[PDB]
Amino acid sequence: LTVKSTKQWTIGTDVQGSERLNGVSYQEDALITYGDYQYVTFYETAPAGYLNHFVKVGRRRVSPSVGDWEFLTLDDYTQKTMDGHNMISMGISGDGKIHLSFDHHDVPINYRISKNGIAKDVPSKWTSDLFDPVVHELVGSQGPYSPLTYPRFEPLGNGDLLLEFRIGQSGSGDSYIHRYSASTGKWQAYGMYIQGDDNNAYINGLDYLDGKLYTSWTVRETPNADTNHGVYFAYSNDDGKTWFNTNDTKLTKPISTSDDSTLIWDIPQNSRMVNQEGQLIDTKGRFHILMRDLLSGEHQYQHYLRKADGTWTKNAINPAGLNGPDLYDPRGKLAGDASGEYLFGILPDPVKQSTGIYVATASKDFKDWKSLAEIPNTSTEPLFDKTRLHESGILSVFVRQAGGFPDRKLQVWDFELDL
Ligand SMILES: *[C@@H]1O[C@H](CO)[C@@H](O[C@@H]2O[C@H](CO)[C@@H](O[C@@H]3O[C@H](CO)[C@@H](O)[C@H](O[C@H]4O[C@H](CO)[C@@H](O)[C@H](O)[C@@H]4O)[C@@H]3O)[C@H](O)[C@H]2NC(C)=O)[C@H](O)[C@H]1NC(C)=O
Ligand SMILES: [Ca+2]
Ligand code: NA
């Protein structure tokens, strides 16, 4: 596999502050293709200046030809909290509505939706008046809505959308799922699905495929990031209502962090493994986790694979030239092509200040990590567009540059693959 073309666009000037608010590992999602268009969301500085930001949403046509980006500015909600948790997630349901949830660290939900199904009935002009106001609840559902952190969306097969998040705090919290019906426009509460025990689960993502929902996590004892332990897994056949472990054993509802039956790899505290890194269900139904640790004696990214025969394996991702990350370094992602043969590691490198794109293949049991491409000049937790890669074989990555304000830009990089 090779690259046919590399293209990039600058979509904004990143915001100033001592935290990164754009390009954060748990944005789910920042960059989405739906129908014939690609969408992106990010903060930009408002006219009041430093510590005042607005959410922006971009769109461009990508099929059957690629058109120019255009942006709207949601100038009715001012983001002011310089806390690296306070990112934006976007989702697009099968009625065409665009959902946003943003700006949380242990506070009530902030959510808004488009008035109309603007990703389905595509409007000529792209303006902020396409969005309804910020609200602090999910119409049709019920709380708790606070203290919330980490909103994550997952589109289901019938057009519906899940929204998942933590209620509680680092070191003591639970997670909940809500489901939006594209047919009725109402939310419903699926309830608490994982319950902490003087700790909290930190999931890596949500991955839905062919009727099954997959997640993986580590458990955090305290607000100190050295107190993560374990790599855990579960899946659901009913979009989050009921859950099973890797051996198909039904779990209690909610899943307790104290239930060791979901553990797939023992990783002690102090292993330099970070929470909320990456996961992937590939199109063949193999599940993958990206984490890191120091347990070999060197810091390395780690690939966990749930193999078709059921066994889990763990392999370091150590292609030539990749500098392995420590606990606080930017987090990566795993992407997959349509065929399920190609696994992409989208791995920020802390020494190079760049994002590496590496590929491994299912034929070689994913052991054949090779450098495929690079995005230079990043200080980001890279995020990609699943649907665009499946539909057109283009790996599209949203990144925050490295460098100083106001030189540091937000970009989208497209790698057209010779798939
Ligand atoms: C429910 O699922 C869990 C989680 O997957 C599963 O537990 C895992 O079982 C496997 C298989 O027994 C364990 O892996 C082995 O552990 C022993 C040590 O106790 C090792 O000796 C093994 O390594 C040898 O065998 C490997 C075979 O490929 C060789 O490759 C290797 O080089 C060694 O010769 C092997 O690693 C694994 O530790 C657990 N995991 C956890 C987290 O407990 C459990 O069995 C499932 N239960 C049911 C009833 O299905
Ligand atoms: Ca997802
Ligand atoms: Na705790």
**Residue 213: which of 194, 192, 234, 198 has the closest Cα?**
234
- Residue 246 CA: which ligand 1 atom is closest? 2
Resolution (angstroms) equals 1.0
For ligand 1, whether the C-beta of 82 sits within 6 Å is no
Q: Is the CB of 265 under 6 A from ligand 1?
A: yes
Q: Which of 233, 249, 307, 312 best tests ligand 1's pocket when mutated (most atoms within 8 Å of CB)?
A: 312
Test site for ligand 1: of 250, 262, 264, 315, most ligand atoms within 8 A of the Cβ: 264
In this structure, which residue's CA is closest to atom 23 in ligand 1? 313
* Residue pair 332/358 in contact by the 8 Å Cβ criterion: no
Phi and psi, residue 163, nearest 5°: -130, 125
Ligand sitting nearest the alpha carbon of 261: 1
Question: Phi-psi bin for 285: left (phi > 0), alpha (psi -120 to 50), beta?
Answer: left
Ligand nearest to C-alpha 90? 2
Cα 193 to ligand 1 centroid, rounded to whole Å: 27
Contact 325, 345 (CB under 8 A): no
d(CA 256, CA 269): 19
Q: Which ligand is nearest to the CA of 204?
A: 2
Query: Which protein residue has the closest C-alpha to ligand 1 atom 10?
Result: 311
Instruction: Measure the CA–CA gap between 333 and 24, rounded to whole angstroms.
Output: 11
Give the separation between CA 225 and CA 237, rounded to whole angstroms. Answer: 32
- If one residue of 231, 246, 262 were mutated to test the ligand 1 pocket, choosing by the most ligand atoms within 8 A of its CB, it would be 246
Structure tokens belonging to residue 397: 């990555």
* Residue bearing tokens 């939310």: 187
- Residues with Cβ < 8 Å from 333, sequence gap 6 or more? 25, 278, 280, 290, 345, 346, 382, 383, 384
Question: Which three-class secondary structure state does DSSP give residue 392?
Answer: helix
d(CA 109, CA 153): 14
Cβ neighbours of residue 418 closer than 8 Å, sequence gap 6 or more: 1, 2, 3, 4
Burial of 134 (0-12, 13-18, 19+ CB in 10 A): middle
Q: Pick the closest to residue 375 from 352, 400, 389, 355 (CA basis).
A: 355
Q: What is the C-alpha separation between 141 and 189, in angstroms, rounded?
A: 5
- Collapsed DSSP state (helix, strand, coil) of residue 59: strand
Q: Please tell me the residue having the least CA distance from ligand 1 atom 50.
A: 247
Q: State whether residue 354 is helix, strand or coil.
A: strand
Secondary structure letter of residue 132 according to DSSP: P
Ligand 3 mean position, distance from CA 358 (Å): 36
Q: Give the closest residue to 119 by CA, choosing from 158, 152, 92, 153.
A: 92
Sign for the pseudo-dihedral over CA of 262, 263, 269, 275: negative
Pocket test for ligand 1, best of 247, 260, 266, 313 (most atoms within 8 A of CB): 247
Q: Whose CA is nearest to atom 5 of ligand 1?
A: 264
Check the CA dihedral 253-216-417-283 and report its sign: negative
State in Å: Cα 311 to ligand 1 middle: 8
Cβ contacts of 295-299, under 8 Å, gap ≥ 24:
295/267, 295/271, 298/324, 299/272, 299/324, 299/325, 299/326
Look at the block and give the residue holding tokens 């491994």: 360
The answer to whether 342 and 1 have CB atoms below 8 angstroms apart is yes
Each domain of the chain, given as residue ranges in start order, spans 1-419
State both tokens at 104: 């949380």
Q: Which atom of ligand 1 is nearest to the CA of 265?
A: 42
**Across the strands, what pairs with 317?**
301
Closest by Cα among 342, 335, 330, 341 to 397: 335
In a 13 Å sphere around the CA of 262, the CA atoms on its Cβ side amount to 28
Q: From CA 177, how far away is CA 404, in angstroms rounded?
A: 38
Tell me the C-alpha distance between 273 and 271, whole Å.
5
Q: Indicate left, alpha or beta for 403 from its phi (over 0: left) and psi (-120 to 50: alpha).
A: left
- Strand ranges across the sheet with 300-306: 278-281, 287-293, 300-306, 312-317
333-336, strands of its sheet edge to edge:
333-336, 342-349, 354-361, 370-375
E runs forming strands in 161-256: 161-169, 172-180, 187-195, 200-203, 207-209, 212-220, 228-236, 255-256
Q: How far apart are the CA of 297 and the centre of ligand 2, in A? A: 32
State phi, psi for 390 to the nearest 5 degrees: -60, -45
Main-chain phi, psi angles of 364, to 5 degrees: -105, 25
Number of H-type helices and E-type strands within the chain: 1, 29
Q: Does residue 19's CB lie within 6 angstroms of at least one atom of ligand 1?
A: no
- Does residue 155 sit in helix, strand or coil? strand
By what method was this entry solved?
X-ray
Whose atoms come closest to the Cα of 223: which ligand?
Answer: 3
Evaluate: CB of 358 within 6 angstroms of ligand 1.
no
Amino acid at 346: I
**What three-state secondary structure class fits 318?**
coil
Hey, whose CA ends up nearest to atom 41 of ligand 1? 264
Distance CA 386, CA 33 (A): 8
Q: What 3-state DSSP class applies to 370? A: strand
- Parallel, antiparallel or unpaired: strands 255-256 and 187-195: parallel
What is the Cα 40 distance to its own chain's centre? 13
Ligand number nearest CA of 32 is: 2
Ligand 1 centroid–CA 312 distance in Å is 8
